[PDB]
A paper describes a structure:
In this invasion model, AMA1 and the RON complex then bind together linking the merozoite and erythrocyte membranes to form an essential structural component that maintains the MJ ring. The receptor-binding site on P. falciparum and T. gondii AMA1 (PfAMA1 and TgAMA1, respectively) comprises a region on Domain 1 of the ectoplasmic domain termed the hydrophobic groove and a region immediately adjacent that becomes exposed when the mobile Domain 2 (D2) loop (residues Ser347-His393) is displaced by the incoming ligand. We have determined the crystal structure of AMA1 from P. vivax (PvAMA1) in complex with a 39-residue peptide corresponding to the extracellular region of RON2 from P. vivax (PvRON2sp1) and, in addition, the structure of the cross-reaction complex formed between PvRON2sp1 and PfAMA1.
Crystals were obtained for complexes formed between PvAMA1 strain Sal-1 (comprising domains D1, D2 and D3), or PfAMA1 strain FVO (comprising domains D1 and D2), and the peptide PvRON2sp1 (39 residues: Met2034 to Leu2072; PvRON2 residue numbering from PlasmoDB entry PVX_117880). A total of 33 of the 39 residues of the bound PvRON2sp1 ligand could be followed in the electron density from Ser2037 to Lys2069. The PvRON2sp1 peptide occupies a groove of PvAMA1 that is located mostly on domain D1 and contributes the majority of the contacts; however, loop regions surrounding the groove also contribute to the binding. The peptide is boomerang-shaped with one wing formed by a disulphide-bridged β-hairpin loop comprising the central segment of the peptide between residues Cys2051 to Cys2063, while the other wing is formed by the flanking N- and C-terminal segments. The loop 129–134 undergoes a significant conformational change upon binding PvRON2sp1, with Asp133 moving by more than 6 Å, and the loop 171–176, which is completely disordered in the apo PvAMA1, makes contacts with PvRON2sp1 and could be completely traced in the electron density of the complex. The loop 148–151 also contacts the peptide ligand but shows no important structural differences with respect to that of the free PvAMA1.
Residue numbers in the entry:
A (entry chain B): 2037 to 2069
B (entry chain A): 43 to 296, 335 to 401, 414 to 474
Write the structure that this text describes.
């Protein structure tokens, strides 16, 4: 996981928010393998 | 009425060459860009941070026929069956055509001022993680200029090698893939974008290759050859541009390059040779046989119009100031303007029909490390 972090692998994510008005919650349909 | 030579040591190429100061303007890795740290859930992550677009760059997935632009594999799909792009969501934020981005932001006045690449970048960079964010972490994007499509990237990773870290074996479908950044025909219309790319990248960043030109170093009144370069065989401009990109500033662990690296190259289109170097250029040499390229630059676009008037404009500009103080500019297309004590030499490879006055007192020179230094005789005056 130190290699993973070092090469640019990111955190487990699902929900996001756009900061450009109008704000809206966008969620990833299926969890990333 | 007197005429004399100025002792002021400047450089007429300053405003023109600013976009080629990759360390100042991009300020991060090129081949592999992972210049910004981000803390998410008390864990540290690396994200691309470059302020310039990287033209023609894509990610090659080893022993896979899936393009990196395909969404990442999700749940019921195997890692190796997907790409790097953002997966399907409740709102279709990625991939997004230009027409879709234009519809989405039709009421946003400020966003109507953005160019296609800046619009794709701003769109992708607007998405913050929900709930406890506190993070500066954003996803990078890839804008396809041919398909006019914006792709948000789920993965910020650009290179993965080493049998213990990845499996190139296509018969091992469950494990992690091997990948590397590269430039090739299939990626030529692509624009790799970190969250930090300048909206005014067209004025501040490289794009087009400079025809009838080679990068050089300004040495007291003339643009001189870079002494320490690495020569490589390159069949064409695309090859030279691929070589310089491969050798360019890398943030990949062996880790922040800050844009330092072998970012620039001179292509000899007659000899079929690529000369790569790691020192920022400060001027151009007008040579009909060369193309000046960078690791950020488009793999194919060429601007053949050398700025011929740069020297004459500056001489004439200064003369608009009886004491005449001529600037330390020893090259021009108006041979008489230089006021050379001997006959100026006619540069045959110069499309601008430049003349150079070689017979003048030089106050600077280039040393072993491509550093331009003031001569010892003059160090005290300056």
């Amino acid at each position: 996981s130190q290699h993973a972090t070092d090469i640019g692998m990111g955190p487990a994510t699902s929900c996001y928010t756009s900061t450009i008005p109008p704000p809206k919650q966008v969620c990833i349909q299926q969890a990333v393998k | 009425p007197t005429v004399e030579r100025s002792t002021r040591m400047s450089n007429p190429w300053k405003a023109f060459m600013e976009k080629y100061d990759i360390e100042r303007t991009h300020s991060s890795g090129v081949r592999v860009d992972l210049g910004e740290d981000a803390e998410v859930e008390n864990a540290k992550y690396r994200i691309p941070a470059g302020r310039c677009p990287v033209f023609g760059k894509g990610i090659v997935i080893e022993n896979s026929d899936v393009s990196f632009l395909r969404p990442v594999a999700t749940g019921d799909e195997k890692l190796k069956d997907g790409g790097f792009a953002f997966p399907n969501a409740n709102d279709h934020i990625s991939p997004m055509t230009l027409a879709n981005l234009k519809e989405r932001y039709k009421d946003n006045v400020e966003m109507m001022k953005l160019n296609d690449i800046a619009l794709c970048r701003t769109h992708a960079a607007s998405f913050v993680m929900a709930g406890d964010q506190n993070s500066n972490y954003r996803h990078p994007a890839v804008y396809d200029e041919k398909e006019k499509t914006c792709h948000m990237l789920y993965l910020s990773a650009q290179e993965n090698m080493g049998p213990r870290y990845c499996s190139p074996d296509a018969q091992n479908r469950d494990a992690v893939f091997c990948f590397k950044p590269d430039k090739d025909e299939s990626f030529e219309n692509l624009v790799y974008l970190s969250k930090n790319v300048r909206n005014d990248w067209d004025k501040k960043c490289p794009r087009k290759n400079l025809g009838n030109a080679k990068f050089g170093l300004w040495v007291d009144g003339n643009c001189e050859e870079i002494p320490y370069v690495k020569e490589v065989e390159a069949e064409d401009l695309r090859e030279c541009n691929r070589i310089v990109f491969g050798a360019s500033a890398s943030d990949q662990p062996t880790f922040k390059s800050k844009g330092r690296g072998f970012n620039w190259a001179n292509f000899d289109s007659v000899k079929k040779k690529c000369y790569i170097f790691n020192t920022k250029p400060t001027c151009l040499i007008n040579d009909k046989n060369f193309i000046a390229t960078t690791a950020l630059s488009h793999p194919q676009e060429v601007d053949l119009e050398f700025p011929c008037s740069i020297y004459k404009d500056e001489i004439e500009r200064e003369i608009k100031k009886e004491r005449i103080v001529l600037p330390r500019i020893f090259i021009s297309n108006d041979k008489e303007s230089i006021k050379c004590p001997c006959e100026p030499e006619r540069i045959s490879q110069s499309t601008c029909n430049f003349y150079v006055c070689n017979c003048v007192e030089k106050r600077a020179e280039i040393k072993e490390n491509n550093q331009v230094v003031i001569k010892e005789e003059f160090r005290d005056y300056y």
